[PDB]
Amino acid sequence: KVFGRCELAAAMKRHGLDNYRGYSLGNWVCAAKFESNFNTQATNRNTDGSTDYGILQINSRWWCNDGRTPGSRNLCNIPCSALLSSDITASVNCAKKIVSDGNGMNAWVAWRNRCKGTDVQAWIRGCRL
């Protein structure tokens, strides 16, 4: 599923991500924009053999099981395929674990490089939320 901008903002809010760990909804929408262009089915292979899955491109090294990432963990206790669903519940619940892990949203390199410090409220501007 390819979410609309405001549509994803609303779904994220619905699942309690707005201001989770102090990160405003715009931060999450921004991260999702540059990680997946709002596409739940986005996947990308990393040089190290792990794979990133879903709207927030959650990585199989630590967070989900895809059966093909040697030495990895599955700390969200989910198959990585669950992160590709049209229903964003699994991605949101797993992202809550990730952003609580110590470095906040810097865990998402694209958030640090393209969202951090910018006018992230622009991403939810105009949205009925």
Curated annotation (Swiss-Prot):
Known catalytic reactions: Hydrolysis of (1->4)-beta-linkages between N-acetylmuramic acid and N-acetyl-D-glucosamine residues in a peptidoglycan and between N-acetyl-D-glucosamine residues in chitodextrins
What is one process in the GO biological process aspect for this record? defense response to bacterium
The UniProt entry, under InterPro entries, shows: Glyco_hydro_22 (IPR001916), Glyco_hydro_22_CS (IPR019799), Glyco_hydro_22_lys (IPR000974), Lysozyme-like_dom_sf (IPR023346)
Coiled-coil residue windows: none
Q: Which SMART domains match?
A: LYZ1 (SM00263)
Q: Where in the cell is it found?
A: Secreted
Q: Which cysteines are joined by disulfide bonds?
A: C6-C127, C30-C115, C64-C80, C76-C94
List, in alphabetical order, the Gene Ontology terms for molecular function in this entry: beta-N-acetylglucosaminidase activity; identical protein binding; lysozyme activity
Q: Which Pfam families match?
A: Lys
Q: Which residues form the active site?
A: E35, D52
Note the Gene3D superfamilies from the entry: 1.10.530.10
Gene Ontology cellular component annotations, sorted alphabetically = cytoplasm; endoplasmic reticulum; extracellular space
Task: Cite the C-type lysozyme domain residue spans from the record.
Answer: 1-129
Enzyme Commission (EC) number: 3.2.1.17
Residues recorded as binding substrate, renumbered to this chain, are D101
Span-the-membrane segments of this chain are none
- The highest taxon in the source lineage is Eukaryota
CDD domains per record = LYZ_C
State the protein's purpose. Lysozymes have primarily a bacteriolytic function; those in tissues and body fluids are associated with the monocyte-macrophage system and enhance the activity of immunoagents. Has bacteriolytic activity against M.luteus.
Family matches, as PANTHER family: LYSOZYME C (PTHR11407:SF28)
Q: How does it assemble?
A: Monomer.
Misc. comment: Lysozyme C is capable of both hydrolysis and transglycosylation; it also shows a slight esterase activity. It acts rapidly on both peptide-substituted and unsubstituted peptidoglycan, and slowly on chitin oligosaccharides.
Name used for this protein in its record: Lysozyme C
Organism per entry: Gallus gallus
Taxonomically, what lineage is the organism?
Eukaryota, Metazoa, Chordata, Craniata, Vertebrata
From the UniProt record, report the name of the gene that encodes this protein. LYZ
